[PDB]
Design an enzyme around this catalytic site. Structure first.
Site, PDB file in Angstrom:
ATOM      1  N   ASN A  75      34.687  39.160  41.816  1.00 49.90           N
ATOM      2  CA  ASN A  75      35.286  39.401  43.067  1.00 49.90           C
ATOM      3  C   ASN A  75      34.990  40.762  43.224  1.00 49.90           C
ATOM      4  OD1 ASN A  75      37.195  39.712  44.912  1.00 49.90           O
ATOM      5  ND2 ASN A  75      38.862  39.496  43.337  1.00 49.90           N
ATOM      6  N   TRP A  76      34.268  40.795  44.626  1.00 46.01           N
ATOM      7  CA  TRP A  76      33.704  42.039  45.303  1.00 46.01           C
ATOM      8  C   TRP A  76      35.030  42.916  45.819  1.00 46.01           C
ATOM      9  CZ3 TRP A  76      28.367  40.358  47.598  1.00 46.01           C
ATOM     10  CH2 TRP A  76      27.968  39.753  46.711  1.00 46.01           C
ATOM     11  N   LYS A  77      36.107  42.275  46.207  1.00 43.08           N
ATOM     12  CA  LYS A  77      37.356  42.514  46.818  1.00 43.08           C
ATOM     13  C   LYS A  77      36.945  43.505  47.837  1.00 43.08           C
ATOM     14  CE  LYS A  77      39.735  43.046  42.131  1.00 43.08           C
ATOM     15  NZ  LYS A  77      40.696  43.613  41.522  1.00 43.08           N
ATOM     16  N   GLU A 113      46.474  41.244  43.987  1.00 39.56           N
ATOM     17  CA  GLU A 113      46.672  42.290  45.170  1.00 39.56           C
ATOM     18  C   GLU A 113      47.301  41.600  46.393  1.00 39.56           C
ATOM     19  OE1 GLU A 113      42.558  42.927  44.733  1.00 39.56           O
ATOM     20  OE2 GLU A 113      42.696  43.859  42.807  1.00 39.56           O
ATOM     21  N   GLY A 170      36.175  41.778  38.365  1.00 41.14           N
ATOM     22  CA  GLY A 170      36.150  42.619  39.539  1.00 41.14           C
ATOM     23  C   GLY A 170      35.179  43.633  39.599  1.00 41.14           C
ATOM     24  N   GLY A 171      35.461  45.076  39.095  1.00 42.82           N
ATOM     25  CA  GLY A 171      34.614  46.039  39.125  1.00 42.82           C
ATOM     26  C   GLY A 171      33.158  45.958  38.278  1.00 42.82           C
TER      27      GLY A 171
END
Lengths: 250, 250
Positions: A9-11, A98, A237-238
């Site tokens: 997930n590159w958000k 989020e 994520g990160g």
């Protein structure tokens, strides 16, 4: 048979130049090391056309981070599944923490999205998870039960082949405080039971659904998570956002 | 003179194929006929990189339909102004009626976005307007004053050069019921008066702010709207989404 899935997930964390480099690097390196696992990436919507063209024909699946429950229509600021299907994006994430917290998305809004997407032959990655306060007040089960039952209300079992779940406790998202394998395994086993219990004794449904773990997943902790019986992969994520840590998850 | 702006909002109404065709046609057609007027288009986020490329170096400004109030960061599904600046997009819409009603955007949320964008040297197109029910009940002035005052809370005079307002009464959005020129003028006059009252000296800056009318704008009604003293342009939905009606506005 359950798919093992490693999803990035590159958000809203990357520039276009980063996203494009990442996609080229991923195409070059991941298919050859992914083995039995499904690889998946969720770029920002602004970069999806670009990244989708880069990854087309590769085995790396591209999904969207959000959408609205409508075909083309008058919804300023929103993305339609009609627009996603056009560019070959067929996986959509729903109910990310989020979005729940900062965009106020409820379980009912999630349900509207999920039903629209499943009815229209999309694959859905639906996120659930409790906060630190919910965990500390013994509400973990009430929250997760609610997220599943209300999120997945009114969806017939035949659509569940196109559903993927992610458990991401909010206390683990971006904090560096990964759930332990036992903690995650405990929750995943509860979720799996809830899924069975939606249709009453639907063991084939509940045993066929991938349930991913997310919240501080990194190359050095993924393996011990994946070893657990009810953990079918990672939503990351990160650590998905640089090629070297993303490849290091496989 | 204040600048006249004719802005098209493509909402979520178009396929990529359609957005591309429209962007090309616009590039071919509008620069020759816009004359004194600023032309602007707001494609769907999924299409912004593509459309932006098509229009780069033309006199047609590309804007985004929404963003979040942060630079690159962990907000799944959202678009950062950092990501927009990168592809040359420097105008962002805030507070469109569809976001207020269907995505729950409050005045205070809008104010957060406006402050972040103006601080970062973006241009903001901030949308205000009352519902039919609010109009009928005696709340037109209360609602508009509220949206303006709460929306622009704590914004310095220095940034007003980069603020554009649009009045779009909700009863005129997609209903085919455009405001008469008098009806629009009377509310634009009021909006401008509200701006003039935001702080000592404000009247010295309130004549400079463009206030656009939106809601069922079309070629056969735009000229009479633009004639009114406090109407500085149009924000155009449906009629902007085909080249022949968009060009007929100029």
């Amino acid at each position: 048979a359950r798919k093992t899935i490693i999803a990035g997930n590159w958000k809203m964390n990357l520039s276009l130049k980063e996203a494009v480099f990442l996609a080229h690097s991923i195409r070059e390196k991941i298919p050859s090391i992914s083995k039995d696992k499904v690889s998946m990436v969720f770029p920002s919507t602004l970069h999806l056309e670009n990244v989708s063209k880069i990854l087309e024909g590769s085995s790396v699946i591209v999904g969207a981070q959000n959408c609205y429950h409508s075909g083309l229509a008058a919804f300023t600021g929103e993305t339609s599944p009609d627009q996603l299907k056009e560019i070959g994006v067929k996986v959509v994430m729903v109910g990310h923490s989020e979005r729940r917290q900062f965009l106020g998305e409820s379980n009912f809004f999630c349900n509207d999205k999920i039903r629209f997407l499943l009815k229209n032959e999309f694959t859905v990655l639906y996120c659930v998870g409790e906060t630190l306060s919910e965990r500390e007040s013994g509400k973990t089960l009430e929250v997760l039960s609610s997220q599943i039952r209300e999120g997945l209300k009114g969806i017939d079992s035949v659509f569940f082949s196109n559903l993927i779940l992610a458990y991401e406790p909010v206390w683990a998202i971006g904090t560096g405080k990964v759930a332990t394998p036992s903690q995650a395994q405990e929750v995943h086993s509860f979720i799996r039971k809830e899924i069975s219990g939606l249709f009453v004794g639907a063991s084939s449904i509940s045993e066929s659904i991938s349930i991913l773990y997310g919240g501080s997943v990194k190359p050095d902790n993924i393996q011990d998570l994946l070893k657990e019986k009810d953990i079918d992969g990672g939503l990351v994520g990160g650590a998905s956002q640089k090629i070297s840590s993303f490849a290091g998850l496989f």
